[PDB]
Design an enzyme around this catalytic site. Structure first.
Site, PDB file in Angstrom:
ATOM      1  N   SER C 134      -1.707   0.255  -8.396  1.00  0.00           N
ATOM      2  CA  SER C 134      -0.656   0.749  -7.518  1.00  0.00           C
ATOM      3  C   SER C 134       0.636  -0.011  -7.741  1.00  0.00           C
ATOM      4  O   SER C 134       0.626  -1.127  -8.247  1.00  0.00           O
ATOM      5  CB  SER C 134      -1.075   0.547  -6.058  1.00  0.00           C
ATOM      6  OG  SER C 134      -0.016   0.883  -5.171  1.00  0.00           O
ATOM      7  N   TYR C 147      -5.032  -4.529   0.834  1.00  0.00           N
ATOM      8  CA  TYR C 147      -5.062  -3.550  -0.250  1.00  0.00           C
ATOM      9  C   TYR C 147      -4.177  -4.033  -1.418  1.00  0.00           C
ATOM     10  O   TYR C 147      -4.624  -4.062  -2.569  1.00  0.00           O
ATOM     11  CB  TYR C 147      -4.605  -2.195   0.294  1.00  0.00           C
ATOM     12  CG  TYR C 147      -4.383  -1.117  -0.742  1.00  0.00           C
ATOM     13  CD1 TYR C 147      -5.426  -0.301  -1.169  1.00  0.00           C
ATOM     14  CD2 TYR C 147      -3.108  -0.881  -1.256  1.00  0.00           C
ATOM     15  CE1 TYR C 147      -5.196   0.744  -2.087  1.00  0.00           C
ATOM     16  CE2 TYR C 147      -2.872   0.143  -2.164  1.00  0.00           C
ATOM     17  CZ  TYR C 147      -3.912   0.953  -2.571  1.00  0.00           C
ATOM     18  OH  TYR C 147      -3.637   1.978  -3.442  1.00  0.00           O
TER      19      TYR C 147
HETATM   20  N1  LIG Z   1      -2.263   8.147  -2.580  1.00  0.00           N
HETATM   21  C1  LIG Z   1      -1.467   7.123  -2.833  1.00  0.00           C
HETATM   22  O1  LIG Z   1      -0.457   6.981  -2.143  1.00  0.00           O
HETATM   23  C2  LIG Z   1      -1.864   6.131  -3.950  1.00  0.00           C
HETATM   24  C3  LIG Z   1      -3.168   5.955  -4.452  1.00  0.00           C
HETATM   25  N2  LIG Z   1      -3.417   4.940  -5.428  1.00  0.00           N
HETATM   26  C4  LIG Z   1      -4.751   4.675  -6.009  1.00  0.00           C
HETATM   27  O2  LIG Z   1      -5.293   5.900  -6.507  1.00  0.00           O
HETATM   28  C5  LIG Z   1      -6.728   5.846  -6.434  1.00  0.00           C
HETATM   29  C6  LIG Z   1      -7.119   7.124  -5.717  1.00  0.00           C
HETATM   30  O3  LIG Z   1      -6.387   7.284  -4.513  1.00  0.00           O
HETATM   31  P1  LIG Z   1      -6.345   8.696  -3.758  1.00  0.00           P
HETATM   32  O4  LIG Z   1      -6.819   9.802  -4.608  1.00  0.00           O
HETATM   33  O5  LIG Z   1      -5.019   8.766  -3.131  1.00  0.00           O
HETATM   34  O6  LIG Z   1      -7.326   8.493  -2.528  1.00  0.00           O
HETATM   35  P2  LIG Z   1      -8.276   9.455  -1.714  1.00  0.00           P
HETATM   36  O7  LIG Z   1      -8.669   8.695  -0.512  1.00  0.00           O
HETATM   37  O8  LIG Z   1      -7.618  10.755  -1.526  1.00  0.00           O
HETATM   38  O9  LIG Z   1      -9.491   9.529  -2.721  1.00  0.00           O
HETATM   39  C7  LIG Z   1     -10.276   8.357  -3.017  1.00  0.00           C
HETATM   40  C8  LIG Z   1     -11.612   8.833  -3.574  1.00  0.00           C
HETATM   41  O10 LIG Z   1     -12.449   7.717  -3.962  1.00  0.00           O
HETATM   42  C9  LIG Z   1     -13.633   7.728  -3.163  1.00  0.00           C
HETATM   43  N3  LIG Z   1     -14.224   6.441  -2.757  1.00  0.00           N
HETATM   44  C10 LIG Z   1     -13.710   5.581  -1.854  1.00  0.00           C
HETATM   45  N4  LIG Z   1     -14.569   4.608  -1.575  1.00  0.00           N
HETATM   46  C11 LIG Z   1     -15.621   4.898  -2.333  1.00  0.00           C
HETATM   47  C12 LIG Z   1     -16.805   4.169  -2.361  1.00  0.00           C
HETATM   48  N5  LIG Z   1     -17.020   3.137  -1.537  1.00  0.00           N
HETATM   49  N6  LIG Z   1     -17.752   4.638  -3.203  1.00  0.00           N
HETATM   50  C13 LIG Z   1     -17.568   5.734  -3.951  1.00  0.00           C
HETATM   51  N7  LIG Z   1     -16.430   6.425  -3.899  1.00  0.00           N
HETATM   52  C14 LIG Z   1     -15.436   6.025  -3.092  1.00  0.00           C
HETATM   53  C15 LIG Z   1     -13.296   8.530  -1.936  1.00  0.00           C
HETATM   54  O11 LIG Z   1     -14.491   9.147  -1.412  1.00  0.00           O
HETATM   55  P3  LIG Z   1     -14.728   9.367   0.144  1.00  0.00           P
HETATM   56  O12 LIG Z   1     -13.708  10.260   0.671  1.00  0.00           O
HETATM   57  O13 LIG Z   1     -16.160  10.068   0.220  1.00  0.00           O
HETATM   58  O14 LIG Z   1     -14.881   8.019   0.742  1.00  0.00           O
HETATM   59  C16 LIG Z   1     -12.444   9.618  -2.559  1.00  0.00           C
HETATM   60  O15 LIG Z   1     -13.369  10.525  -3.190  1.00  0.00           O
HETATM   61  C17 LIG Z   1      -7.066   4.575  -5.681  1.00  0.00           C
HETATM   62  O16 LIG Z   1      -7.394   3.501  -6.570  1.00  0.00           O
HETATM   63  C18 LIG Z   1      -5.758   4.214  -4.973  1.00  0.00           C
HETATM   64  O17 LIG Z   1      -5.720   2.797  -4.856  1.00  0.00           O
HETATM   65  C19 LIG Z   1      -2.384   4.119  -5.902  1.00  0.00           C
HETATM   66  C20 LIG Z   1      -1.097   4.310  -5.409  1.00  0.00           C
HETATM   67  C21 LIG Z   1      -0.858   5.301  -4.452  1.00  0.00           C
END
Ligand SMILES: NC(=O)C1=CN([C@@H]2O[C@H](COP(=O)(O)OP(=O)(O)OC[C@H]3O[C@@H](n4cnc5c(N)ncnc54)[C@H](OP(=O)(O)O)[C@@H]3O)[C@@H](O)[C@H]2O)C=CC1
Ligand SMILES: NC(=O)C1=CN([C@@H]2O[C@H](COP(=O)(O)OP(=O)(O)OC[C@H]3O[C@@H](n4cnc5c(N)ncnc54)[C@H](OP(=O)(O)O)[C@@H]3O)[C@@H](O)[C@H]2O)C=CC1
Ligand SMILES: NC(=O)C1=CN([C@@H]2O[C@H](COP(=O)(O)OP(=O)(O)OC[C@H]3O[C@@H](n4cnc5c(N)ncnc54)[C@H](OP(=O)(O)O)[C@@H]3O)[C@@H](O)[C@H]2O)C=CC1
Ligand SMILES: NC(=O)C1=CN([C@@H]2O[C@H](COP(=O)(O)OP(=O)(O)OC[C@H]3O[C@@H](n4cnc5c(N)ncnc54)[C@H](OP(=O)(O)O)[C@@H]3O)[C@@H](O)[C@H]2O)C=CC1
Lengths: 242, 242, 242, 242
Positions: C134, C147
């Site tokens: 990020s 985070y």
């Molecule tokens: N959106 C934003 O503003 C930004 C996002 N990011 C990074 O992008 C990546 C994705 O973010 P984003 O798509 O927005 O997030 P979302 O919350 O929309 O999606 C995250 C996904 O990862 C899954 N996940 C979370 N915890 C686990 C776990 N314990 N085990 C298995 N799967 C897991 C979630 O599943 P579930 O829903 O079932 O828990 C979901 O499927 C992350 O690394 C985030 O740090 C970086 C900068 C900005």
């Protein structure tokens, strides 16, 4: 601290940071060579700090600088402080602004530093050089594109100088302050609304004091920072953390 | 420096950098709370620095730490120094090494800093917190991926803490040394060939001394760095410039 | 791009960035192993992307993860994307939030990457691993200290992995986005005034789209970035230049 | 990628990276304005890429550059690639080496970028500008102190340009390669022992290929990097992680 028996050279010594750096070094026992553009600034300074060696020269002039400093003698500590700000939005930067800015803000740093380092090496003495940079070598600032570029270049100059002179026991570091209310600081934060929101963005909710900058410079010049070389100390009231 | 009337807390005070930081602060007039894992180190330290307040706890334990420090009283200066290095190549890193390294090197920094900041804020006093990081927060080192990651996390912890605590007049900075021959330094530079090559890469052709680190910590804790918060000072003997 | 004949593994595949990354790779001919926490997400994704291999596991659980992924087989492309945001001001961070954040956001990256890299090395094939980080691995953001810390550690995790796996021809990079309006971006920018001011500070005056992040992930996974490893691509709409 | 209907201008188009960038853009459908110092390089290039528009001018001359490019017309994509390396250790840097290096490597980037950006803004169209920097904007390199300084300056120039032009939908990024065996790369890594040590320090144990550099340039010029502006992509074969 104690700089007795040491001789220091401070550029841009007539006003602001440089003047106070000369005063601090003078009080610590250092023999000081004060280099600056306006002679009257050296006249008043010599009255305030009896014993300093004034040198009036435009550091933007390579030949003049060579003639003026070519033979000043042994220098143990160097503070490259002289710089100028020519504020212009990117689309309005002129050839003259760029030329004057790089000549004074960076070319003079190469020149004086090589003269001083050659001397240090010749006498076989360790040394400490401080390059007065800015937080804008890292963060952007409106109307300062040319100035920011000279400080960004200074970052690598400081790093490369540290690498090349390191084996000669010469340390090179920079000090990177945020706005400091000297003539230069008042110039860039002239807009009251800008200054207001600018100060507010600072975690410490303040601008830096000249004293804060002088303190870091002295720390880096002293033997209290014997393993510090190549980087810098931010005197930015936490701005980079914003 | 003059720290008379101020109370400091140093973690990992039993050996190395932490032990000398306690001695330097004690010599400067500060009341020092020394927190470390091995009780016998506190016994000897108390003989050398009569008046220190010893606290024996394993900082990797959140519950024990809360009980051991929940009532230590007013703290004006904090040095988060305790850390452990578990050397393992990336492909051999275990869950255990990860958990222990993050609990001690980073989670404890969160907890103790929270406890101390609440007190500073409540007493309405400024404060200065120094997190002892490493140059490996920025550069790679063989067998130190987990340790490096804890230090990498520390960079943002330091920046974020400076941003959040700045309005409360609390400054937070880090010191980032290269190898320092304490127990940890010798362990990490065990291979002679590697140590030779490593030293040779340093512009200053040496590793840092404990004293060099301690000097930077005191500078950051003092009022002579009043506009410095959120970043760090490299005590890397020029490594990042190599 | 063409990923025909390659097998990829994308974590956090059930929603947002991860979900679309799976779709893009699937559309590019790659065999995709989608790993996510909520099974129902895998069920709908399997309808939309026939052929993917769904794996439902909590990446915060080391033992469940080893059980679920210990035998997936050959993986040529890895996208470590799973993460969770637990918003808390610094003085309110709990042991629980820290532990959950580090096990999911960072320990899982160590674990899954080890398994995959070990496989690439066994087969003697090159590989590309992308760690979704990020812009907060570099800049501060209110209520995201924990985070942000996990992302800062990721910066070093990425460099060290690139350094150690580079001789085995495995590249490791990160993508560093600003806010993307997925469920995560939504919660993180729930305050309207805050969101407006945040948007206004971005030079491009906008937040990043999911497609922008996916595009950089694909670029790094492809042979179009053959000499890129150890750093990241900022998908920040210019935020770091503000 | 498809650049049909778009017009690009590439400086330093006669050899190396610049020549291949023109070739790649030409093949992708853009009309290319090839700017370079030696006219005969343009004669051979026009044979290879029929339809390009040759411009022969010394970019170190502000007045000549203005006459030559003031009337080129609409430009949608800009690649500031021209640069020269004058190898000299610090203590041997000359006034002329400094001046020529900053005139070609940085002053021309200000000038050409201003002209192109004013045009984009005048036409009310978005734009993408790529500044070819180097990894040495961040890491030191023997005998390249002057050249490194110009690239260090380019980092802030790129950042500040992204800040100022972002509100106009103009993206500005850099590409930062390690040694690439063009004529410049050969010049710089002439010493066999040095080149050997240098190569071995690279995690990927290789130097970058021109194609690698061109690939990142095209990615940045394309709309597949729609939220990327202000920073750069390292094409360093992992050097910064060493
Ligand atoms: N959106 C934003 O503003 C930004 C996002 N990011 C990074 O992008 C990546 C994705 O973010 P984003 O798509 O927005 O997030 P979302 O919350 O929309 O999606 C995250 C996904 O990862 C899954 N996940 C979370 N915890 C686990 C776990 N314990 N085990 C298995 N799967 C897991 C979630 O599943 P579930 O829903 O079932 O828990 C979901 O499927 C992350 O690394 C985030 O740090 C970086 C900068 C900005
Ligand atoms: N004030 C601020 O907000 C900040 C300043 N800095 C840096 O601190 C340093 C000092 O700045 P500051 O004290 O504020 O500035 P001032 O304008 O107060 O002082 C600058 C001094 O340098 C001298 N100088 C400038 N050009 C030349 C030249 N061509 N030849 C010889 N001497 C010259 C000036 O001489 P004269 O007046 O006679 O022309 C003056 O004495 C600079 O490097 C600046 O970039 C960094 C961050 C913030
Ligand atoms: N030495 C080097 O090469 C470098 C060191 N540093 C940093 O400097 C700091 C000090 O290192 P250094 O002095 O070399 O290390 P030492 O190993 O010499 O001393 C570390 C001290 O921290 C204490 N400590 C460790 N774990 C705990 C714990 N779980 N609970 C309470 N106290 C603990 C140790 O106690 P005990 O022995 O009883 O376990 C010991 O007293 C660390 O942050 C290290 O990361 C940074 C760069 C380089
Ligand atoms: N090669 C390497 O190892 C690396 C290169 N780079 C960067 O890549 C870019 C291109 O380098 P590369 O292709 O290797 O170099 P080359 O020397 O192979 O090509 C540079 C081109 O730019 C032209 N040029 C130089 N000065 C001028 C000028 N004054 N006016 C007009 N044209 C000029 C040269 O023309 P002419 O020959 O006729 O003088 C030549 O056509 C540069 O910015 C360089 O800094 C970055 C990292 C590494």
């Amino acid at each position: 601290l104690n700089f007795s028996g040491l001789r220091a050279l401070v550029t841009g010594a007539g006003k602001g940071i440089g003047r106070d750096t000369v005063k601090a070094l003078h009080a610590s026992g250092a023999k000081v060579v004060a280099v600056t553009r306006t002679n009257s600034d050296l006249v008043s300074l010599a009255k305030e700090c009896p014993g300093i060696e004034p040198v009036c020269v435009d550091l933007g002039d390579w030949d003049a600088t060579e003639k003026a400093l070519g033979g000043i003698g042994p220098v143990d500590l160097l503070v490259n402080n002289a710089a100028l700000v020519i504020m212009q939005p990117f689309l309005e930067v002129t050839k003259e602004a760029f030329d004057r800015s790089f000549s004074v803000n960076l070319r003079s740093v190469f020149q004086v530093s090589q003269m001083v380092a050659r001397d240090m090496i010749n006498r076989g003495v360790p040394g400490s050089i401080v390059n007065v940079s800015s937080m804008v070598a890292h963060v952007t600032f409106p109307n300062l594109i040319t100035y920011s570029s000279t400080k960004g270049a200074m970052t690598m100059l400081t790093k490369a100088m540290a690498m090349e002179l390191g084996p000669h026991k010469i340390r090179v570091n920079s000090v990177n302050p945020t706005v400091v209310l000297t003539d230069m600081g008042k110039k860039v934060s002239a807009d009251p609304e800008f200054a207001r929101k600018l100060k507010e963005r600072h975690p410490l909710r303040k601008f830096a004091e000249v004293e804060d900058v002088v303190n870091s410079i002295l720390f880096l010049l002293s033997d209290r920072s014997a393993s510090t070389s190549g980087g810098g100390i931010l005197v930015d009231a936490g701005y980079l953390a914003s």
